Design an enzyme around this catalytic site. Structure first.
Site, PDB file in Angstrom:
ATOM      1  N   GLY A 243      -5.342   2.995  -3.122  1.00 14.73           N
ATOM      2  CA  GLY A 243      -6.645   3.536  -3.456  1.00 14.73           C
ATOM      3  C   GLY A 243      -6.505   4.982  -3.895  1.00 14.73           C
TER       4      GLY A 243
ATOM      5  N   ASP B  78      -1.700  -0.279   6.075  1.00 14.28           N
ATOM      6  CA  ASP B  78      -2.017   0.446   7.303  1.00 14.28           C
ATOM      7  C   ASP B  78      -3.519   0.631   7.507  1.00 14.28           C
ATOM      8  OD1 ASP B  78      -1.880   2.675   5.178  1.00 14.28           O
ATOM      9  OD2 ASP B  78      -2.652   3.778   6.911  1.00 14.28           O
TER      10      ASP B  78
ATOM     11  N   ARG C 145     -14.528  28.190  -3.870  1.00 17.58           N
ATOM     12  CA  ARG C 145     -14.104  27.476  -5.073  1.00 17.58           C
ATOM     13  C   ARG C 145     -13.854  28.377  -6.271  1.00 17.58           C
ATOM     14  NH1 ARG C 145     -16.919  23.752  -7.637  1.00 17.58           N
ATOM     15  NH2 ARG C 145     -15.223  22.417  -8.417  1.00 17.58           N
TER      16      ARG C 145
ATOM     17  N   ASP D 185       0.836  -1.163   0.000  1.00 13.30           N
ATOM     18  CA  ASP D 185       0.000   0.000   0.000  1.00 13.30           C
ATOM     19  C   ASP D 185       0.888   1.236   0.000  1.00 13.30           C
ATOM     20  OD1 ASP D 185      -0.977   2.081   2.295  1.00 13.30           O
ATOM     21  OD2 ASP D 185      -2.591   1.496   0.907  1.00 13.30           O
TER      22      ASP D 185
ATOM     23  N   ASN E 179      -8.573  -0.692   4.275  1.00 17.94           N
ATOM     24  CA  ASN E 179      -8.691  -1.172   2.899  1.00 17.94           C
ATOM     25  C   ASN E 179      -7.612  -2.192   2.521  1.00 17.94           C
ATOM     26  OD1 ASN E 179      -6.767   0.909   3.022  1.00 17.94           O
ATOM     27  ND2 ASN E 179      -7.062   1.452   0.863  1.00 17.94           N
ATOM     28  N   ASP E 180      -6.593  -2.308   3.367  1.00 14.74           N
ATOM     29  CA  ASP E 180      -5.529  -3.292   3.173  1.00 14.74           C
ATOM     30  C   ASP E 180      -5.871  -4.611   3.853  1.00 14.74           C
ATOM     31  OD1 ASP E 180      -4.076  -1.293   1.876  1.00 14.74           O
ATOM     32  OD2 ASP E 180      -3.018  -0.705   3.714  1.00 14.74           O
TER      33      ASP E 180
ATOM     34  N   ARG F  90       2.571  19.712  -4.199  1.00 18.31           N
ATOM     35  CA  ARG F  90       1.458  20.659  -4.139  1.00 18.31           C
ATOM     36  C   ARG F  90       2.001  22.036  -3.755  1.00 18.31           C
ATOM     37  NH1 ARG F  90      -2.953  20.310  -1.922  1.00 18.31           N
ATOM     38  NH2 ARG F  90      -4.322  19.056  -3.285  1.00 18.31           N
TER      39      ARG F  90
ATOM     40  N   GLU G 169      -2.651  22.471   6.106  1.00 16.20           N
ATOM     41  CA  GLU G 169      -2.398  23.629   6.964  1.00 16.20           C
ATOM     42  C   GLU G 169      -1.332  23.332   8.029  1.00 16.20           C
ATOM     43  OE1 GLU G 169      -6.444  25.499   7.998  1.00 16.20           O
ATOM     44  OE2 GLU G 169      -5.363  26.984   6.783  1.00 16.20           O
TER      45      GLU G 169
HETATM   46  F1  BEF Z   1      -2.204   3.767  -0.638  1.00 15.66           F
HETATM   47 BE1  BEF Z   1      -3.141   3.206   0.192  1.00 15.66          BE
HETATM   48  F2  BEF Z   1      -4.248   2.768  -0.488  1.00 15.66           F
HETATM   49  F3  BEF Z   1      -3.522   4.109   1.144  1.00 15.66           F
HETATM   50 MG   LIG Z   2      -2.894   3.177   3.148  1.00 12.68          MG
END
Ligand code: BEF
Ligand SMILES: [Mg+2]
Ligand SMILES: [Mg+2]
Ligand code: NA
Length: 994
Positions: free
Chosen positions: A626, A703, A489, A351, A706-707, A560, A442
């Site tokens: 993701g 972490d 915006r 990830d 989703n992993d 950024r 910030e």
């Molecule tokens: F890159 Be992982 F999906 F946060």
């Molecule tokens: Mg992650």
């Protein structure tokens, strides 16, 4: 509520029949509660019974030994009415051994669980609802929230349920969704239907997911789902519905355990089959048994003989040892066989956000204007070290350190950054880390100001708590913030109106400090600052600023960027109206360009090296994230997955792209590709599955929630210590300190562990092959016992067992991290290593017999009988004509037996050295290479001469000291086991692989 995201605010209120104004009624609550249940998960399945001690007994090696321990008991009990209850202490001590070993197993299981568990905070979590009871808000416990009800969220709140946003009270609402989606930057939410039918969680921009947090703003929503039905719940189930095979090491042991199971069964037959038709006239009548059915009993007594009693303990000692070596590098391993898994891994899936990266926005570049001479514009560009929110790092110019204070341009830049800011920093004393308060992008500035320390303020003695916002405090003392012009915006920027605070050094300037998207901001600038002076915004200046901004925005550093300015001469408060954000763009004009800041979610520092190390060890690394594709690749490039300007044509895929592929090609893509972006938790798993379908042993590192499924699916899941609680419980390893290089260490560890095992399995087993071959030669030739069952129990467990243990300290080769990963199918013991230690077991057998025999027939200390008398010693009688001069008791002399034991030991101590290297002569790697071995060798011998000379021992072991010339013979017999093995090692390097 199904797909609230595809609906409308009204459609959603309607659906539950509620007021956005009052909220649910207690009757509505009552029902809603009983229909849906408590917004929470079921009690963690985390309660393993002590009958999970019966999981420590799934190892075919213990099963095998437990059979041989019960086959011993069933073949020991009542087998001779005249039995003294002290010959049963084999199966009994086998018990106490396995009982123990199967326990030190369960020790690490919970020793691990509550180390990992120690890493969580807090006790409970709660939310804010409007029900029709009170007109006001209510702090309710998160579990008691039901679908339908009206929740309110503000900056810093963890979203209690999955929610359909109804109204955004702040001008703008930002959400940190990284634990769920892997998204690097907080996401701006809206309150409109998401029609899209293929639309995914990162597209549900009108939804708030339980588990997630508010980066900025305040909002009102209606709960769509709860408990198990949240995106958090779904994945929880998904993870628990993922099945798992046993560790590849456990698999290799069970594969071996069954090879042993075959040979044991082959012998029980072979010998039984060879004799049943030879039992007639036995003479067994007195003995009350049926034979060629009692011959059976001796066949199995050979079976049990072939089992290395001490094995499952040494293994479980090797592992546990390596586990503890990893725990000093801060890696918690859940189970013992797992310390190997990484040593044989082909692909590491990883990830991105929070795994490969810190998920802590860092400003790493910044510039101001140096000189403006007509068409000439120079910049002062700086860099900042640091990768987290921690105020630890330095400001460099041209890669050497400066005091930011020395540049007045940096002083203003700091000031804008401190003032034009709704966020802050905080030290979490419990976790021992600094954390953002508010918005990531910030806090990056807050941290930057602390690092910059523009006034050279003393901060040394401050608690990490007080140090977090120190330098910012100092700046906030120069100017009272009177109000803020919130982002919008349309102009993509913000600013704060500031009056000078102390009437000291105040030029009455009621400055406005401004920040936003660079060209939006720059286009409203007329001047540029150069130190404390101001000059007109010429064209080549604008071209100079912008050229660098485009650089920072692209390529090697894909930062950024943010432009910073001030309005030197702001309007009056009177003439400015706030309730309309459309005025703001105009208030922020006629500005003075100050500088720019570049920031990213940076790679963890160790990562890049680690990834090279892996590559050098034959292991692929794949990113599955993701997060969006652009950030995914940028990051792959920085860390080396891809190169500087390498083409990633068919080598990077989004979720959509992948899903569009046909299954055949999907599996194909997992073979070539190394970057998957915008993927769902399901993809993460599917991809692992695909790699495992090439018989490939894969790891997963992550972490967020989703992993989780992908982590449960891999042969090893590694979880970051600061990761979610789900990711940890699905993983088998946990890096407590997030140090990605432990992975590269936990691996080479697991290559050493395999080699040592493979090594001390060859050593211990040749023992039992010698011991067996000897008991068989004795019965076939008809000589007296050379070694007795107990003499062996001790040799196997102790004498041999220690040098076996100290094989777990055989120095690892340096070529170890140079070779690829071993092949999956390639077995533990090959048909060569077999023959190899069977030739050792062979010789050993012969030798120990030779020993006892040589005494009977040639030793000057003991009467030199003929081969015929020795062969027929059972027929000896009070001065039999054929045993002239002999005492029949002499066939029980302790001398031939002491002679036979010593040959074993001295060959095992000898052959222990042979077990230093699979093929490297004792010349190359000398006896003295391993020191913890020589320690065992001498402790073994020491405990030998002990048994010989220590009063009570000689009697209970049936032995007697050996004289010099005798020991002199013990050696003459044992040494050649070296020359023998040496001959085998040569065979397997100069002729085979040559
Ligand atoms: F890159 Be992982 F999906 F946060
Ligand atoms: Mg992650
Ligand atoms: Mg035995
Ligand atoms: Na796993």
């Amino acid at each position: 509520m199904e797909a609230a995201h595809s609906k409308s605010t009204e459609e959603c209120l309607a659906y539950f029949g509620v007021s956005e104004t009052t909220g649910l009624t207690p009757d509505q609550v009552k029902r809603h509660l009983e229909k849906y249940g408590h917004n929470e998960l079921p009690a963690e399945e985390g309660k393993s019974l002590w009958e999970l001690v019966i999981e420590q007994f799934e190892d075919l090696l213990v099963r095998i030994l437990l059979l041989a321990a019960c086959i011993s008991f069933v073949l020991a009990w009542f087998e001779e009415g005249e039995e003294t209850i002290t010959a049963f202490v084999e199966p009994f001590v086998i018990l106490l051994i396995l009982i123990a070993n199967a326990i030190v197993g369960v020790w690490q299981e919970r020793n691990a669980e509550n180390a990992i568990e120690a890493l969580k905070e807090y006790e409970p979590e709660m939310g804010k609802v409007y029900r029709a009871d009170r007109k006001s808000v209510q702090r309710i416990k998160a579990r008691d929230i039901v679908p339908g009800d009206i929740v309110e969220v503000a900056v810093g709140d963890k979203v209690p349920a999955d929610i359909r946003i109804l109204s955004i009270k702040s001008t703008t609402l930002r959400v940190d969704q990284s634990i769920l989606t892997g998204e690097s930057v907080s996401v701006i939410k809206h309150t409109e239907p998401v029609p899209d039918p293929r639309a995914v969680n990162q597209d549900k921009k009108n939804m708030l997911f339980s588990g997630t947090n508010i980066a900025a703003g305040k909002a009102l929503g209606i709960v769509a789902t709860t408990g198990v039905s949240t995106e958090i719940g779904k994945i929880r189930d998904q993870m628990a519905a993922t099945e798992q095979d046993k560790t590849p090491l456990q698999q290799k042991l069970d594969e071996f355990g069954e090879q042993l199971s075959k040979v044991i069964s082959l012998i029980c037959v072979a010998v039984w089959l060879i004799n049943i038709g030879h039992f007639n006239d036995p003479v067994h009548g007195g003995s009350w048994i049926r034979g060629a059915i009692y011959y059976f009993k001796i066949a199995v007594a050979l079976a049990v003989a072939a089992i290395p009693e001490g094995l499952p303990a040494v293994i479980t000692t090797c592992l546990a040892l390596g586990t503890r070596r990893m725990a000093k590098k801060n890696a918690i391993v859940r189970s013992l066989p797992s310390v190997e898994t990484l040593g044989c891994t082909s692909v590491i899936c990883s990830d991105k956000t929070g795994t490969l990266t810190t998920n802590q926005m860092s400003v790493c570049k910044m510039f101001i204007i140096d000189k403006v001479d007509g068409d000439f514009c120079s910049l002062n560009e700086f860099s900042i070290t640091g990768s987290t929110y921690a105020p630890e790092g330095e400001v460099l110019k041209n890669d050497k350190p400066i005091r930011s204070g020395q540049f007045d341009g940096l002083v203003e830049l700091a000031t804008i950054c401190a003032l034009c800011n709704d966020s802050s920093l905080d030290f979490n004393e419990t976790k021992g880390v600094y954390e953002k308060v508010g918005e990531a992008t910030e806090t990056a500035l807050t941290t930057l100001v602390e690092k910059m320390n523009v006034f050279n303020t003393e901060v040394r003695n401050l608690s990490k708590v007080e140090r977090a916002n120190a330098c910012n405090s100092v700046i906030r003392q120069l100017m009272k913030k009177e109000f803020t012009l919130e982002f919008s915006r349309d102009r993509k920027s913000m600013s704060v109106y500031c009056s000078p605070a102390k009437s000291s050094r105040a030029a009455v300037g009621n400055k406005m400090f401004v920040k936003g998207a660079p060209e939006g901001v720059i286009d409203r600038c007329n001047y540029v600052r150069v130190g404390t002076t101001r000059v007109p915004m010429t064209g080549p200046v604008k071209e100079k600023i912008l050229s660098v901004i485009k650089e920072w925005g692209t390529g090697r550093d894909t930062l950024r960027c943010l432009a910073l300015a001030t309005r030197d001469t702001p309007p009056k408060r009177e003439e400015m109206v706030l309730d309309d954000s459309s005025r703001f763009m105009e208030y922020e004009t006629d500005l003075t360009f100050v500088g720019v800041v570049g920031m990213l979610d940076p790679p963890r520092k160790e990562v890049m090296g680690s990834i090279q190390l892996c590559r050098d060890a034959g292991i692929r690394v794949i990113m599955i994230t993701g997060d969006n594709k652009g950030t995914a690749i940028a990051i792959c490039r920085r860390i080396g997955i891809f190169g500087e300007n390498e083409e990633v044509a068919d080598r990077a895929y989004t979720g959509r792209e992948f899903d569009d592929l046909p299954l055949a090609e999907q599996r194909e893509a997992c073979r070539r590709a190394c970057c998957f972006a915008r993927v769902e938790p399901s993809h993460k798993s599917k991809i692992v599955e695909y790699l495992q379908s090439y018989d490939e042993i894969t790891a997963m590192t992550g972490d967020g929630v989703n992993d989780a499924p992908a982590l449960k699916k891999a042969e090893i899941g590694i979880a970051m210590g600061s990761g979610t609680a789900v990711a940890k419980t699905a993983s088998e390893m946990v890096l407590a300190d997030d140090n990605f290089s432990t992975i590269v260490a936990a691996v080479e560890e697991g290559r050493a562990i395999y080699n040592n095992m493979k090594q001390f399995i060859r050593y211990l087993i040749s023992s039992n092959v010698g011991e067996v071959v000897c008991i068989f030669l004795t019965a076939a030739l008809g000589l007296p016992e050379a070694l007795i069952p107990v003499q062996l129990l001790w040799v196997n467990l102790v004498t041999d067992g220690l040098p076996a243990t100290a094989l777990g300290f055989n120095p690892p080769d340096l070529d170890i991290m140079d070779r690829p990963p071993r092949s999956p199918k390639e077995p533990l013991i090959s048909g060569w290593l077999f023959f190899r230690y069977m030739a050792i077991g062979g010789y050993v057998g012969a030798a120990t017999v030779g020993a006892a025999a040589w005494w009977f027939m040639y030793a000057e200390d003991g009467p030199g009988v003929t081969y015929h008398q020795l062969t027929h010693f059972m027929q000896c009688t009070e001065d039999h004509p054929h045993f002239e001069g002999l005492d029949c008791e002499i066939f029980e002399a302790p001398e031939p037996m002491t002679m036979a034991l010593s040959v074993l030991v001295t060959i095992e101590m000898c052959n222990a050295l042979n077990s230093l290297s699979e093929n490297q002569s004792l010349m190359r790697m000398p006896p003295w290479v391993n020191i913890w071995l020589l320690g065992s060798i001498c402790l073994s011998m020491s405990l030998h001469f002990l048994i010989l000379y220590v009063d009570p021992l000689p009697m209970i072991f049936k032995l007697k000291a050996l004289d010099l010339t005798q020991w002199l013979m013990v050696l003459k017999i044992s040494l050649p086991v070296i020359g023998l093995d040496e001959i085998l090692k040569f065979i397997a390097r100069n002729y085979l692989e040559g």
